Design a protein around this ligand. Structure first.
Ligand SMILES: Nc1ncnc2c1ncn2[C@@H]1O[C@H](COP(=O)(O)OP(=O)(O)OP(=O)(O)O)C[C@H]1O
Ligand SMILES: [Ca+2]
Ligand SMILES: [Ca+2]
Ligand SMILES: [Ca+2]
Ligand SMILES: [Mg+2]
Ligand SMILES: [Mg+2]
Lengths: 735, 146
């Protein structure tokens, strides 16, 4: 942010050697304060009156406290400040003179002050005893009742001990005094007048030059970013909506740091958090039932699907069960069902959370039962006493959507195996992603391989060699027996997370069972809120799919951390046929790129599968083949553009030899597009290809000479019979 | 199992270069059908696939015989992806272009001390069109191009 602005380089080295002499006398900070304060100083030519491109109506003259005395004769000023949002210092200079009668510069100096007073310290953090007390020295601190310079028409008031009692009433007035205090401390003539008269304000400003200015200039700097940041809720504000179990998050806090890598989770469901801390295991890959969000079973994965989020959906239940059953059938011994048991605490929670209502007791077969209530009108629930098991049945006047009707039976929830014993299953921690630092990945490659590579003489080879390393040891993701599809370093990162919450006192197994949702290529899910745990150890929770994609560009992406995004973004996800958008750089530059031989052929292939008509039909029409021969012709140029032997030429040439290569391509395109009947589906694609080639060639121009335009350069050629001098022409066409 | 999509492409290309429009292609032709598809088997590795199916005028392959050959080399590799991720990595800033500035800035974190001289070097030999920077396109080249 360049603070100084000279509108006219008119006058010689005297307006300049004069504007300079001015500014170099102000502390490099008083400015760095004015800058951060969004201020800008205006050094134009002669513009006395309201003629400056900023001296119009906005926030001008309203009340008359105006100079080193008031006077409000606007027609007689050369320095001005546009007070309201951003400060705008506007100054002009006429012929050679400020150094004889300096009383004229003492203004461009104070005239400023009101740039930093009210925002300085006088009122900048708030009046702080620093200034407040320094003001009290109206007359009773130092044996110096000398302040006939800054305090008269408003402050000939010795009669009332000046403190918090009334210092507010006249904020502006205590400015008219700080501003002179500043004008005097820097005025190229009267320096001591201050030190001589007022003994404090001197040492005040003095300590400001000593560092006081580098202060605020750093309380605005820091409150510069933390001011215009990204709305994220941090601390235990987010960790709340997050879902993770607090003791766990914190537990994680350690690994993020140690291993220096960002961890990002999708929403863990609330109705499972305690269950987790409670000891309930988590849903792994082996189970695909739906959790439940009502009744006791809530937060558990009911064996009956009509007791989970899909209550009523005749099909998702009639297909939900299919899976639970199989889940046990297949992976028997590890995946089973066990009777529900809402422990003591869990109850008092489904209480205020608003899920159940405990009441009317009852007896049946000689055992005590507390009729657990709920508003759901399809089942009745109740919990035992000895063992607090839970049971339900259909009501005396209703039926199941599947069509079943049963009496009191135990509510079996799903459960996996953990140390020989089956524990009930609940929501797990699904990672939205893991951002390790690029350095941690370097610590991932074995010291000898990465050593055996940088010795390669071939520089180009050394780049490749390295990349494949980074790829190899940190980007590649393969499948895995248990933990789904993830990276190796990712796996080790997975355990360290679990073993972490294991020492935190968990007893239900792991809490992170599979890889990062950024590999959920098949059925990708798009969550709004995303909890994060930075490398420092803070907690952040984006609010938008955008924010996230943004909080990540800003901290994970462009900050030496390694992140990769879902291969299915900006495409339709097979599984759920979903389209989730994510800013992809590469694609952000396709607009200006001459397609590839193969990217081109690929495109045709595509359209052929859709209009069921190819760029050229397999017929006998000598018009068709012409079109054929002609695409082959582009499929030629296009790849000729990207010829690797372009290394033996010099930059200049490259752009040239290519701006042409590409141009030839544009040609033949043009040709075909002005041919026989080419389905209007290609008509368009081919049209799109043009804009590109064009764009790419324009880019290859702005790197070299500047006025030359495509449309024109092209016009000026002759692709009739000979390409001979056409090219030589093209050279001169660039002078 | 080459995906249908992955097939229509090998025909839209297999055919696009079958000059005498029949249904088989010459050896040289095969090389071209390939390169165009983005690949370039050695002027000698190009005959191993073809020599394996000698039931023609000896030096020609139809469509169905090519649709197969595209296994020996393709039923394993899935690297095109990764290489595009790596790219997004060096392209630190987000300009879809990899500047020499960042080439170095990333080359130094993975532990390699590069000379502000030899970086401009690579970046140079990687750029094919002169803009002094590298894009995914030329980047893919640099890499895979063995
Ligand atoms: N690396 C991976 N390998 C295998 N599966 C993965 C991987 N990363 C993510 N997944 C799949 O992502 C899935 C997450 O989607 P989803 O189950 O809809 O989440 P949820 O919102 O936490 O709960 P629901 O079960 O849907 O109620 C579960 C998991 O099998
Ligand atoms: Ca043929
Ligand atoms: Ca870049
Ligand atoms: Ca380039
Ligand atoms: Mg799930
Ligand atoms: Mg899961």
């Amino acid at each position: 942010n360049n603070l100084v602005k000279t509108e006219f380089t008119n006058e010689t080295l005297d307006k300049i050697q004069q504007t300079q002499d001015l500014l170099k006398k102000i502390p490099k900070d008083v400015l760095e304060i004015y800058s951060e304060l969004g201020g800008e100083i205006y050094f134009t030519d002669i513009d006395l009156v309201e003629h400056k491109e900023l001296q119009d109506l906005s926030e001008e003259e309203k009340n008359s406290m105006n100079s080193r005395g008031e006077k409000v004769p606007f027609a007689s000023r050369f320095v001005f400040e546009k007070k309201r949002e951003t400060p705008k210092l506007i100054i002009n200079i006429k012929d050679y003179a400020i150094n004889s009668e300096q009383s004229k510069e003492v203004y461009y100096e104070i005239g400023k002050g009101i740039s930093l007073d009210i925002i300085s310290k006088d009122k900048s953090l708030d009046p702080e005893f620093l200034n407040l007390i320094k003001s009290l020295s109206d007359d009773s601190d130092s044996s110096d009742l000398l302040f006939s310079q800054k305090f008269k028409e408003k402050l000939e008031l010795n009669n009332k001990s000046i403190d918090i009692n009334f210092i507010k009433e006249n904020l502006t007035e205590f400015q008219h005094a700080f501003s002179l205090a500043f004008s005097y401390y820097f005025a190229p003539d009267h320096r001591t007048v201050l030190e001589l008269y007022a003994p404090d304000m001197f040492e005040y400003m003095n300590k400001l030059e000593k560092g006081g200015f580098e202060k605020i200039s750093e309380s605005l700097k820091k409150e510069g970013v933390e001011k215009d940041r990204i709305d994220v809720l941090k601390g235990e504000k987010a960790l709340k909506a997050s879902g993770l179990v607090p003791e766990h998050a914190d537990a994680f806090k350690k690994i993020a740091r140690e291993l220096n890598t960002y961890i990002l989770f999708r929403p863990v469901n609330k109705l499972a958090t305690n269950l987790i801390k409670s000891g309930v295991a988590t849903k792994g890959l082996n189970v695909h039932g739906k959790s439940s969000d009502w009744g006791p079973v809530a937060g558990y994965i009911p064996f009956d699907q009509d007791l989970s989020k899909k209550h009523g959906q005749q099909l998702a239940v009639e297909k939900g069960n299919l899976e639970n059953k199989k889940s046990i059938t297949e992976h028997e011994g590890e995946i089973g069902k066990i009777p529900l048991k809402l422990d003591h605490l869990r109850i008092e929670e489904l209480k205020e959370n608003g899920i159940i209502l405990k009441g009317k007791k009852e007896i049946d077969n000689g055992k005590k039962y507390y009729l657990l209530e709920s508003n759901n009108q399809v089942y009745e629930f109740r919990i035992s006493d000895e063992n607090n098991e839970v049971q339900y049945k259909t009501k005396e006047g209703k039926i199941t959507v599947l069509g079943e009707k049963f009496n009191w039976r135990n509510i079996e929830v799903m459960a996996k195996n953990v140390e020989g014993v089956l524990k009930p299953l609940t929501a797990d921690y699904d990672l939205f992603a893991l951002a390790p630092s690029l350095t941690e990945i370097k610590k991932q490659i074995p010291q000898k391989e990465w050593d055996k590579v940088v010795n390669t003489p071939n520089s180009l080879e050394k780049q490749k060699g390295v990349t494949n390393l980074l790829i190899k040891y940190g980007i590649e993701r393969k499948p895995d027996s248990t933990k789904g599809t993830l990276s190796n370093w990712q796996k080790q990162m997975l355990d360290r997370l679990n073993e972490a919450v294991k020492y935190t006192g968990y007893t239900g197994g792991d809490v992170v069972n599979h890889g990062t949702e950024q590999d959920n290529e098949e059925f990708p899910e798009k969550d709004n809120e995303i909890f994060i745990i930075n490398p420092e150890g803070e907690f952040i929770l984006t609010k938008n799919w955008e924010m996230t994609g943004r909080f990540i560009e800003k901290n994970i992406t462009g900050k030496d951390y390694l992140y990769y995004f879902n291969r299915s973004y900006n495409k339709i996800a097979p599984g759920n046929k979903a389209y989730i958008e994510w800013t992809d750089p590469i694609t952000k530059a396709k607009i200006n790129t001459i397609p590839t031989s193969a990217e081109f052929i690929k495109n045709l292939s595509s359209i052929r599968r859709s209009s069921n008509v190819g760029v050229y039909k397999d017929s006998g029409d000598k018009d068709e083949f012409a079109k054929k021969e002609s695409v082959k012709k582009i499929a030629g140029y296009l790849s000729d553009y990207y010829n690797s032997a372009n290394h033996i030429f010099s930059q200049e040439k490259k752009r040239k030899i290519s701006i042409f290569r590409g141009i030839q391509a544009y040609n033949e395109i043009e040709n075909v597009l002005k041919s026989k009947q080419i389905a209007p589906e290609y008509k368009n694609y081919f049209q799109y290809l043009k804009e590109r080639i064009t764009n790419q060639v324009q880019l290859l121009l702005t790197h070299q000479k500047s006025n030359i335009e495509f449309k024109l350069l092209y016009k000026q050629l002759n692709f009739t019979e000979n390409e001979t001098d056409n090219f030589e022409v093209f050279q001169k066409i660039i002078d | 199992q080459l995906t249908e999509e992955q097939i229509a492409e090998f025909k839209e290309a297999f055919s696009l270069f079958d000059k005498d429009g029949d249904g088989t292609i010459t050896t040289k032709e095969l090389g071209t059908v390939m390169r165009s598809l983005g690949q370039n088997p050695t002027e000698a590795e190009l005959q191993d696939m073809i020599n394996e199916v000698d039931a023609d005028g000896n030096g020609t392959i139809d469509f169905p015989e090519f649709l197969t050959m595209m296994a020996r080399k393709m039923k394993d590799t899935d690297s095109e992806e990764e290489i595009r991720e790596a790219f997004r990595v060096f392209d630190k800033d987000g300009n879809g272009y990899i500047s020499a500035a960042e080439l170095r800035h990333v080359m130094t974190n993975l532990g390699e001390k590069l000379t502000d001289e030899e970086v401009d070097q690579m970046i140079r030999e990687a750029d094919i069109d002169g803009d002094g920077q590298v894009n995914y396109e030329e980047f893919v080249q640099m890499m895979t191009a063995k």
